[PDB]
Each structure stands twice: as structure tokens, then as C-alpha cells.
Amino acid sequence: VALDVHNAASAWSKALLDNAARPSGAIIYKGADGQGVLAPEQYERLIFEMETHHQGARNAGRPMLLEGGLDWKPMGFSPSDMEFHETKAAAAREIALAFGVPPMLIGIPGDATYANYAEANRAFYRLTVLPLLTRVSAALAWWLSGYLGAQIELKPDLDQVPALAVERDQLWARIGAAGFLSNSEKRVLLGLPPT
Amino acid sequence: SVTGRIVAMASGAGRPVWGPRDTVSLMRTGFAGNPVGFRSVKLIAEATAAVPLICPVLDLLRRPNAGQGRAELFEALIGQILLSGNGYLEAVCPEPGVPRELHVLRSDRMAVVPGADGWPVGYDYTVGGRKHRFDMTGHPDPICHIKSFHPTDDHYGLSPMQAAAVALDVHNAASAWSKALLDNAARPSGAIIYKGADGQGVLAPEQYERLIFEMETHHQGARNAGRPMLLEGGLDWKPMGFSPSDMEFHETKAAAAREIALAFGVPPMLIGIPGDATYANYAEANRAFYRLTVLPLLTRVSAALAWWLSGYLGAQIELKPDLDQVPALAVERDQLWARIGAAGFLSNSEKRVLLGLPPT
Amino acid sequence: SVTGRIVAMASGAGRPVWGPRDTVSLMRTGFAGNPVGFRSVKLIAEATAAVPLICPVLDLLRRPNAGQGRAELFEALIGQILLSGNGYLEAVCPEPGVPRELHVLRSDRMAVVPGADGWPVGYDYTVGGRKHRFDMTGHPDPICHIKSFHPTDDHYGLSPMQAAAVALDVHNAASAWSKALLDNAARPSGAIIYKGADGQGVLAPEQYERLIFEMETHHQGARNAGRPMLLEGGLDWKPMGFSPSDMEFHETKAAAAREIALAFGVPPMLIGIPGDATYANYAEANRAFYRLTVLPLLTRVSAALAWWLSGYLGAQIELKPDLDQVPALAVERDQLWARIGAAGFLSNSEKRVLLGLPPT
Amino acid sequence: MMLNEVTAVPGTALPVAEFRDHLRLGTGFADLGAEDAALLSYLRAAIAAIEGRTAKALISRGFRLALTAWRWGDMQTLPIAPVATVTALRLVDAAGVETPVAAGWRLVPDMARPRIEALGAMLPMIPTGGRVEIDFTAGFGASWSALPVDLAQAVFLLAAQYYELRHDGAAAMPFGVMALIERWRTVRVLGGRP
Amino acid sequence: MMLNEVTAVPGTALPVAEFRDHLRLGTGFADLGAEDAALLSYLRAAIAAIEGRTAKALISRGFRLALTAWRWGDMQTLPIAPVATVTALRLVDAAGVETPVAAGWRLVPDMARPRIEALGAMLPMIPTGGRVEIDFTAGFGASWSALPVDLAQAVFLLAAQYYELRHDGAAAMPFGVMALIERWRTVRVLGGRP
Amino acid sequence: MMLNEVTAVPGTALPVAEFRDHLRLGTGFADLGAEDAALLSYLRAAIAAIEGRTAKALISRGFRLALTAWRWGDMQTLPIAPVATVTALRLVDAAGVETPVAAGWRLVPDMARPRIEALGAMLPMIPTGGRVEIDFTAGFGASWSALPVDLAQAVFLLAAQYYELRHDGAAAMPFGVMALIERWRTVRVLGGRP
């Protein structure tokens, strides 16, 4: 549902910029009657004084004498910005919600949930990547072991993946500062080959 | 490979498969047309060319051909992958091993041939009505075909510009909205209405040149701003406005300018678009840029050069990005050197093997 | 290569190919026309000239010719690349090696010739109706042709001004909107409406000079601001307003003033345009400027001078930017010296070799 | 752009014998007495009021459209709407050498927007000072019977009004004069540069 | 798009002898025929008024629709609404040769949208600089009796009005002239590109 | 969708002898003199004004509804409202093989929305180019007496009005013509895609 909102709200603004007639005004010419056209002699006079002397940046604001019958009604454009702007941006967040990516990584706008990308990249490799990768690798560990004789395990590294460095600072400085237990007693905790 | 034969017959073996027609028009309307699509590819293609590589073979990559340097090659190579999802590299071999010419063939004029077993047998460089028919029915296989991931197609890539092709046309037309609004708009700063005794009445060209000369001299311009302007009977001055003044599709352009930057994967802070502060202080956004959309792209192309060029050599060569002395990753390098450097319990050579140093 | 031979005969061998039509008009409307497009090129072209180089040959670069210095050469060279996507350098060689003249040929009046095998044989300098026909059918090849990346064209560059050509015409016309609005506008500060006994009636020129002189003396000006202004029968004062007062295309100009700065790649903080704070404190935005749009641009031109000028020498020379003692990269140099200087585990000579020092 | 008529109506093409019947036939005083050539002078005044409000021609008179510069690149909409067969697109120069052209343009007829619409993108350029000049025959048919009869009734509703009361005296019909004209007026919404 | 008529109505198909019953002229006089020259002059002036307000045809005379470029890629809605049996889409060339084409075009009958939709996804192409005239006979029936009677009444309410007042003199019914017409007008809401 | 009537009324089914009594019976000049076949021509004009405003049929004439594509998947609301017994749903192809169907659909009668409403979800598909065609008999009853009498009075209030005054002349009744019709008009509020 959130794809079809985001696809059609984005295509709303495309076809609004492509099918829209806004005028910057309208020179209403009634006449002596309630209705009256102006002759093509008068009409090319009316274009050429509008083409040359009134349109464009360089003619912005000429005082524009209006004789009897003529009148200039300036039109507006009342919804100018923001055509389904928030409902697209809410749907652009629900698509990112379903796959599980944070809004900060993909680049969609929104309120600051995560702080400073040491978290949101660490949240990305912990809620929707490494649970996904440890589930496929558990199936390659069993399907490919059916071709071998001995069964093999196959898991993600969960080490030297640089989005999990904030979980690695936090665990090395905890045990490195624990001075009570000895040197070889903490190489076995951090995953080191003991000496 | 066993199922390869079944998909080949449906497409038709020995016949060129084209894929997307409108590929050449997204280039002129989305990469030569708007700055956001222009800057996003130029920001990536000049970043992947700057990253050094780790292996001989790199002597070819350093000087591929005349007039097309090492860094200029990957800008042409990645610049086709981001634009049309496909990268091509012709190798010209006067010599049998390590062919001394590389040429990025543009992917507008290249077409695949499915062949017998589904994997390609021909590539067709089609300029004008002229074809070439490169052959893949051999061992060296003279063109590496780098695909972006496409789930539905079996022969091409997806080209992120195609995924942002609606948001490009919003940004192209909202920017051209304000251009043609500044070029087609009649605003007056007022209107001197002259009705007359009747409901309608013109004023004589004697009176009309009198009306210009008191308007030309005494009322228009900066220096006559605010004259008290006597209006006799019949005359009246109705001042017009311009009711939407700023901001003609200003936020929908600024939202589409971010969705273009979203698809190519650049952060909004690097390209320069306005927007809410997502990343903080450029130590993150430059590090996020070389980790989510540059180094995954470069390690995928370099993995195809590591295998295509090793087919010309005897021994297979690995070829990966350096991920060291690339100065956008210094916050991941401070963080890893100060972690192990502060671990005083393990000895000197026990952390040179961790940080990657040759031990002494 | 092989594809190129086919490409030539499509366009036509031996005949000049011109490329962009409007590149002579984008210069006057986009570089002499608006300050944002003017400053953006001047910000980059004066940055690439300031970067030192690493190699004899640089003695040519220091003094190329009379009246055109080292820094003045690259301002002319990069100033053609940013404007029209192409850089040209004529070399005059009285001597066989290291030709003692360099000349930035402007890219308005230069045209390529595809030649036989697709790679160029002729360049045509066309001023007026007069040509020169430089020849590329030799080894020294007297013009280096520096291309910006263009995916659709085979002979020219893309020229970021072409990608910002809509945002230039918005910024040129919105700025000229406010100019001609301050020059063509009649606002009155009021209107003394005089109807009369009839619906229409003029006032006699005896009465009218009485009406000016009581308005000229007693009501206009700062010193007469607010007189109580008795209105007898028939007379009436309708004060006019001016309903859009400020802000005529103020944000659409300021959004277009950012998209011009976006396309050339300068940050908004360096050039001085207003906008939301993306970069923080100029140690980043100047470091971002010399890393995303200057040093990738400078290492691409210097890689072409390293190969074109080595065709005049016997031995090939490398020529790269210094990437050292360029004072915008000091935050990448603090960050790397304090990392290894604080790493006390590895010895003294083991870190002089990392930081780039001559070892002791 | 002067657009003077080459020839006017003959006068014998106008339905004066029929307008006497729309004035008083089947009901009335008798045939009565009407200055015959007066009744021709009110038909020419009612047609020329409807030729101006509708920009039609109604009798298929010959025209001469002599204008200096082409408005579009190629289009050149003709003002008098029901056209047929450009007589000539002769092109005079500033001195009067009057060199006609015979190809390069194909008149595309239409009651809405008659055009010249040259072949490709090249319409005959103008000698500097030498106005271009287009002679054409515009209108429905040669006789009065070839007209749309609703437009012919708007002449008879109007020419009888100029006969029934002379000065501008005061007097809302469902299909009046104005309601029969409005499907022949030109509906334009351009006030722009093209 | 010119849309002229090949043949007009015969005049003998118009119900002058029944319109005379409507207007209450007289029953058994020996003259009985002093108005025949003018009664059908107002019936043709009231049908042609309702043929333009409704875009209907009412006598099924033959038409000729000479146009040059197709309005939409395949559809080509015809203006005169109640159609049957499009005769010929003869495709003229740039000049001269007129080749009638079966061409694989269909006809979708409707009172609202009388399309000419093509079956091969593209109507027969048009020689650049040449028109494509379509002969078709459009209307309700051949005689007056085959009409919808309310539209036939709207002619009699209107042509009686032209007979009773000659010039534009001003003078509320439940189903007047206008309220009978309005279920036969064309209701359109597109001002767009397609 | 042409929807022409197969046969019209016979004329002898209309209450001309009763409409003379609604015109002047019990009060009046005498029976007076009325062109009998004229009075039949105003009843057919008042019924056809109320057949159009109500979309009813009132005499139970035979219809032929020949339309190209089905609007819904299965529904197909019939326009002329009081229906009974589809004669045939014959299906012609692009060449005219005219293969009727005899099952697969069950007409669901109703004065509001008469339907075709095929069984399940499969309604007979259309041969490409070969328009489907539905013949049905729609209306209240064969004689004038089978009508709702309030709708019959709206004919007599209207057909007398076309008899009493000929041209469109000006003249708020509680149950007038318009108030007797409004409970037989079709009340629709869809302007949408289904």
C-alpha cells in the first residue's frame, strides 16, 4: 500500500507540472454587449503590446492602461507547493520501515530518531542485516554440507565488520579496564589466541 | 547452467536483445538536464576513480590507452554503470597475454545475444546501421560485462536513474516551471482604468500621449515611487498584485531533489541540497558515502576486473579496494588504532598483527 | 578501437564535428551574467592554480609564455573546462623535446575531426571564417585535449554549466525581475479622486495649480507626513497600497542560486549564498571543496599533462597534485599525525615512514 | 497587414428578393412599399456586422492579405475563416519586383484556424522592406443558397431590425441574433507570445 | 477538419404541410400556398439552429469530413453525432491521386461518441501535405417521421417563433425550446491534451 | 451504444380519444374543432419529452441495445428503465456471423437499475470488433391504461401545453409537469470510474 501511495503521489506532482494551465492573468474583453469578440486587426495589436511590453522579466510591472471594455483579472494558484508532500513523506518512511532500514541511512527526511550514524549503521547491521545474513548462511551451512561428508557450520563473522565497532570499543574498554583479572584471563574473553 | 538452455530459446538465440529503449533519453533529460542527477553521478564516478587498488595487471589499469588515463577510465566505466546499469570493457590484444588496450564501450549502443546455453555469445556495438558482433564463444571472452543487480531482467542492469525517473521529471519540470514563469508572466503594477461617460470609451491619441508622458516621467521608476496621482472623473487606478510571489513548487522540487540523491545513494549533505540535518559534521557523511554507495560499488567492479583480466593471465589475481589511505575512512581508522593502541595488556607484536603492520 | 573505426564513418571522416551550439551564449549569460555562476568558476579555477605539483618539465609550466604565468595558465585552462567541458593546450616546439610554449586555446572556436579510426586526426581552430587544421597524425600530438566526462558524446565534455542551464536562466531572470520591477512600477502613495457634480468632471487649470501647490508644499515629503487634509465636497483621497512589497521570487532565486553552486560542486558556505547550515565551521567546507571538486579535477588534468608532455620527452613523467602543504587539508593532517604520534608502541623510525618523512 | 477586399459583392448575389419575403410575406400589410435599393443597403450592413463578430465572409469574396513579417516560423493563421484555394502568394520586394512563389506552402483549410503551414520548417522569407502578400478567396459559396441557414437567418434577423427601426431605439429571444452567431465566433484563449 | 455537406436536404422531406398545421394558418382556403416559399425557409433556419446547438443532423444527408492530421493516434471522433455506414475514407495524396482505403478501420456507432476507431492500432497513415476526407451519411433517418419527436417538436417550437416575430424583438415554458434540446447536446468536460 | 427503437408506437395505442377529453370535456367551447392527427403529434412530443427526462418508456416498445464493450465486469445497467424479458442477446462478430446466446445471463428487472447481471462472474465476452447486441422490450404495458396515472397526467399536462400555445411564449403549479416527473427520474450520484 505504501508503495502505491509513494508511486502515485510522486506521479501526482509530475503530471501536475505537465497538465496544468495556470495563467498569470486574463485580459477580459466584454464589449458593449455582454459578449463581443475583438477583430483580428485589433487582436494582433493586443498580442504585440502584450508580447513586447508586458510579458517577461524585463517588463515586470508596466502600468498597463485599460480603456473602456478591457479589464485585467490576475489569476492566482492557490495550492502552490506541497501536493501530497507529507503523505508521500510518510509513505516514503513506511517503505523504509518494512524492509527495516533506518530513515537516516537511506536519506529520507524525518525526525531525528538515531543520533550520529554510529548507532543507525550499527542498528542496520543488527536488526535487518545480520539476522538476515545468519539465516541464509545457516541454510548454506546445511545444504552444502549435504554434498560433503562432514557437516560444516557457516556463520557471519561478527568481527571486523566496521559498523559494529561501537559494540567493540564498548567491550574491549570494559575488560581492558578490569585490572583485577590477569592478562591471559582477558585474552580468552575478547577472543584472542591465548599466550 | 542446466536451466540456462530454457531461458535462451524464449528470447531467441543468435539475435540481439536490446532491453530498454528510452535509456539514451534519460541521459539527456536526467544527467545533462538537471544538476542533482548531474552532480550525483559525477560525485560517485570521481570517487571510485580516486580509490587505489591492491593486486603487472595494474600497469594496464594505470595506462589503459591513449588519451584515457587510469582515473579517466573508471569515470567512463562507472559513469556508464550509474547511467545505464551496464559496464563494458573491450580488450585489444596484439600480444597474447595482458592486452595493452582497454576501451569503455558505451552501453547505449551495445546489445547482448543470449546464445545457446543462456550465457551470452555475442555483444553488438551498433552505431548507425553498423554492427560489430563481438564473440564470446572463446576462452578469453574479450568484454567484461558488469551488471548492476536487476531482479526481473536476465541480461542487463537496473541503472538507479531509472528508479528515480519520476523524480527527475518532477525536478526538471518544476525548475522549468519557474523559468517559464519568469519568461511568460504579465504582471502589471497597476492599471489606469478609463471608463468614460459611457460604459466604454477610448481616449484620443492626443490624450493618450499625454497619459504616457505623465506616467513615463512622473510616476514610473524607483525615483517616482509614491506620487499622489490626481485622478479626475472617469479615471481610476486599480493596483494589481501577484498573489503567489515566491515558492512555485519550491518544496516539491526540494523533495524531488532529495529523492534523486536518494537513488544514487549520495547523502544530501555531500551534494549540497538543502534539507534537515541527518548526518552531523562531514566526518560521518563522507564516511557514509564511501561505505554505502562507493566502496560496495567499487569492490563489485574490481571483482569483475579481478576475474576478466585474470583470464588473460595464467595465475588468477585478486583485485580489491585498498580500504586504507583513503582519507574519508579516517574516523574508522582512528577508532580502530586507538582501540588496540590503548589495549596495553597484549604486547607490541600482538597488535602490529591486528592493525596490519609487518611485525618486528 | 575496433568499435571506433565503425563509429567514425557514421559521423563522417575528415569533416569537422562541432558539438554544442549554445556554449558561446552560456558564457555571456552564465559567467559574465550572474555572480553565482561567476564566482563558482573563479572559486575553482583559482584553487587548482594554487595547488603545487610533483614531478625540468615544471620549468615549462612555471613560465609557459609571455604574459601568461603558471597560475594564470591553469586559470585559463580550468576556466575553459568548467565553462565548456574541454581544455586545449597548443605546444610550439622549435626544439624536439619539452616545447617551450603553452597556450590555452579557447574551446568556443575549436572543433574536432574524427578521422579514419575514430580517434581524432584533426582539430580546427575557427575564428571568423579562418581555420588552422592542427594535425594529430604524428607522435608528439601538439594539443592535449582534456575532456570532462560525457556519456552520450564521443568527442567533447559535459560542461557543468550545461547541466545548470535551467538554474542559470531562473537566477538571471529572477534577478532581472526585481531590477525591472524597481524600474517599471508606478506606485502612488494615494490618489485624490475628484468626481464632481456629474459622474465625471475635470478641474480647471486655475484650480489645478492650486491643488498642486497645496500638495507640493503642505502634504508631500517627510516634513509633511500626516497633515489632516481637509476634503471638501467632491474631493476624496483613496490611499493606495503595494501588496507584494518584498520578496519577488526571493526563494526561487535563492534555490536557483544554490543549484548553480550545486552543479559546479562548490559548497554554499564558501561562495556566500544563504542557506541552511550543512557544513559546520569552514575547516570542513574548505576541506570538502579541495576533495570533491578541486583535487579530483586537478588530478585529472595533471594526469593528462603527465602523458602529453611525456610524448615530447623520452622518459615518461608522472605529475600529480601535492596533497601536502595545501592548507585546506590540514584537518586531514592533524588527524593522521596525532593518530600515529600517539601510537607509542611502534618505534620512532617506524612512524617516520608512515607520515612521509625521510627516515633516520 | 492591411487585408482589404479585392472586389466587393456584386449586389446581385444578395437575396434582396428573398429579404422582401422575410420582411413581409404570408403576413403583413401587402408586399407594401420598400425602397428596393434601401433593402440592399441594410443587408450589406447586417452582413458586415456579422462578418466582423464571427470573422467569416459569407459570400466568398476575393481578399488580399499583405503583411510584413511572418508571425510564427511557419504557421500563419488566416483571419477570415472559411477559406478555399490561395489565388497566389506573390512576394513583392522593397522596390516592387513582385516575384510570385508557386510551391513551398500547402493551405490547410478549416473553419476554425485556416493556415498556410509551409512544408517542413521553411516558409518563404520576406525581402527586407518587401512585404509578402497573399491573395485568397474566403467564404462559403458564390450564391446565397450555399450558406449555413442558421447564419443566414442571423442576417435576416438583423437586417430586418435595421429596417424596422432607424435610430438607436430601445426595445431576449431564445435563438436571437446573438445566439445564432456564437457557434461561428472564433474562440481564442491566447494573449501570449505565441 | 472542414466538415462540409455533400448534398443538402431535398426540401420535399421537410414537413411544410405539417408545419402549416402547427402555425394555425387556415384550413380550407383556395389559396393555401402563399406561404410555402417562406415556411420552409424558417424550417431550414430552425433545424440549422438546432443542428449547431446539439451537434446532431436530423435528416441524414451525406457529409464530407476533409481533415489532414488525426486528432488522436487511433480514435478520430466525428463531429456530427448520429451516424451510420461511413462510406469512404478515401486518402488523398499531396496532390491529385485519391486512393480509397478499406484500411482496416471500424465504426463505433453512438449518439455521444461516433468514433471511427482503427483495429490495427493505427489508422491509415496520411501522406505529408495531403488530406484524408471521409464520406459518411450521418442523421436519424431519411424522412421526417424517423426523428425523435421531442427534437422534432423543438424545431416546431423554434420555427414557429421565427414565423411570428421577424426581427429580434424580446418576448419560461416547462419543456421549451431549450429544455427539449438539452438531452441532445454534447456534454464534454475535457479541455486537456488528450 | 446506438439504442435505436426497433418499432415505434402504432399511434392507435395512444389515447387520442381520451386526450380530446382532457383538452375540453365537461367545460369548454364544445368538443370544438381539433385537427385529430395534430393531437396525436403533440402526444408523441410530450411523451418523448418525458421519456427523455425520466428515462422511462411508457408504451412498451421494442428496443435494440447494440454496444461494443461491457462497462463493468458483469453488471450492464440498461438505460430505459421499466424492462421485461430480454428478446435476445445475440452476439455479432466483426464480419456478421450473429451467433446468439441463450444462457449465462439472468435479467434482474427493476424500475431503478435494470441489469443483465450474468451468472457468477462470466458475462459473454465480445468478439474483437464484433459488437454485442441486446434486444429487449421496455415499458409499462401495451395499452395506455397500464401506466401509472400520475405519469400519464404529466403527459396530458404537457401535451395540452403544446396544444394551447405554439411558439415559445411565457406564462408554478403544486403538482405541475415537473413535480409529477421527479419521482420517475433516475437519481444517480456517480461520476466516477465505476
Author numbering:
A (entry chain A): 199 to 393
B (entry chain B), C (entry chain A): 24 to 78, 89 to 393
D (entry chain C), E (entry chain D), F (entry chain C): 1 to 171, 175 to 197
Wording from the paper:
Gene transfer agents (GTAs) are DNA-containing phage-like particles produced by some species of bacteria and archaea. The genes encoding proteins that form Rhodobacter capsulatus GTA particles (RcGTA) are derived from phage DNA, which has been integrated into the bacterial genome. Here, we use cryo-electron microscopy (cryo-EM) to determine the structures of RcGTA before and after DNA ejection, and to visualize the interactions of RcGTA with R. capsulatus cells. Particles of RcGTA have heads with a diameter of 38-nm and 49-nm long tails.
The dodecamer of the adaptor proteins provides the binding site for a hexamer of stopper proteins, resulting in a symmetry mismatch between the two complexes. Adaptor loops from two neighboring adaptor proteins differ in their conformations and interact with one subunit of stopper protein. The first adaptor loop is oriented parallel to the tail axis and fits into a cleft within β-sheets of a stopper protein, whereas the adaptor loop of the second subunit is wedged between two stopper proteins. A hexamer of RcGTA stopper proteins (Rcc01689, g7) binds to the adaptor complex. Each 112-residue-long stopper protein interacts with adaptor loops from two neighboring adaptor proteins. At the distal interface, the long and insertion loops and C-terminus of the stopper protein bind to a terminator protein. However, the long loop of the RcGTA stopper protein interacts with the tail terminator protein and does not block the central tail channel. Furthermore, the end of the DNA packaged in the native RcGTA particle extends through the channel formed by the hexamer of stopper proteins and continues into the disc of tail terminator proteins. A hexamer of tail terminator proteins (Rcc01690, g8) binds to the distal interface of the stopper proteins. Unlike other tail proteins of RcGTA, the tail terminator protein contains α-helices 1 and 2 in its N-terminus. α-helix 1 binds to the insertion loop of the stopper protein and α-helix 2 interacts with α-helix 3 from the same tail terminator protein.
